[PDB]
Structures are given as structure tokens and as C-alpha cells.
Copies of this chain bind each other. A is one copy, B any other.
Amino acid sequence: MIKLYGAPQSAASIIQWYLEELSLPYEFVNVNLKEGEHRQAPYLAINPFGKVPAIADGNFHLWESGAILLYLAEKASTIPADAQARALVNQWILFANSTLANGLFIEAVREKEMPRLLQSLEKILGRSPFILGEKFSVVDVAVGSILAYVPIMLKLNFDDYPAVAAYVQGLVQRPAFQASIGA
């Protein structure tokens, strides 16, 4: 089965949420970051950059939480997808991991970036229940996790963005979220 390498307060929890949404079994392998287990040869053979999360699926190893989400989304796909459909999912995973995370969590750019990012998402989320439309997808796990860590880590809220706040509340109340990030 999928082996997921993680640690507390890492993006491994985001992979755990998507694994809960897909109802896929997996092995959780804790990597002791406090004792530098991630900086030693066995873990460096899984991720040469010494970061969690990572997965092993047989002899296949994969790191970067975003690429793990896209990989799990592809393996669980029923209807074959083309380059454009994968590109729109990849666009949002890249966005969650760079533009969105940086704009919310980098103190020097937050005052400028964060209101703009939330204002743009407010328009999207005010027209559809989820990022890609009516149906929840891996994009909501990627963008939603970054947004949910805003109250958790920044002590900030989404009161000025009612549609963003309702979307984040809805994500937080999903049993798959409560069994993973919410635990």
C-alpha cells in the first residue's frame, strides 16, 4: 500500500485528508525531525532534500505535497483526463504551494497580497460551492488546507470574506477533515 512519510505540523496532514476523502488505506511512517532523522541516508534516499511529506508506492518514491496530491488524484481517476484537464488541476496545486501560501504566510508581503488573494477567491467561491464548481476535488484539499491554516497559525479570520469563511467552515466540518487536519 501507499506509505506516507510525515511528522506533526507538516503538510503530511494534508495528504492524510485527501487519503481520507478517497477512503484509501496507507501506512503512516513518522520521521523524527526533532532528532534529525530526515537528514540521514535512509530518509535522504526517499527525499534527497530531507523534507516531509513523501510517499513510497512499491518501488516508486515521490516528494512535494502538491505532487503527491496530483499523483493520488490521477491514480483514483475513472474518466481518462487530457493535458488541459490535468493542467487546470496542476494550476491550483501550484497556486496553493506558491502564490497563495507566500501571500498569506510571508510577513513582508502579507499586507499587500493577502487581501488581494482573498478578494479574488471571494468572487470565485461566491459563484460556486467549490473551486472547480459543484463538486469537491483535490483542488479544495490544496487551497482549502492553506486557508484553514490561517486561523490555526496566524490568529486571523475571514469575516470580511463571507463566501471564503463559509467555504472554509464547510471544509473543516467534513468528517475526512476532522479525522486528519482537524485531529
Contacts and interface: CB of A to CB of B under 8 A. Distances in A.
Given A48-B124, A49-B116, A50-B116, A71 B94 contact: no
Contact of A62 (B49, B91, B98, B123): B91
Contacts of A93: 67, 94
A73 to B, nearest CB: 9
A87 B61 CA distance: 10
Interface in A65-102: 65-68, 70-71, 74-75, 83-84, 86-88, 90-91, 93-95, 97-99, 101-102
Contacts of A44: 120
Q: How many copies does the complex hold?
A: 2
Interface residues of A, number: 39
B48 A62 contact: no
A48 B125 CA distance: 12
A20 interface: no
A173 B59 CA distance: 37
A95 B63 CA distance: 9
Interface of A: 44, 48-51, 57, 60, 62-68, 70-71, 74-75, 83-84, 86-88, 90-91, 93-95, 97-99, 101-102, 106, 116-117, 120, 123-124
For the complex of A and B, the 8 pairs showing the least CB-CB separation, nearest first, are A64-B94, A67-B91, A67-B90, A71-B87, A74-B83, A66-B94, A97-B98, A64-B91
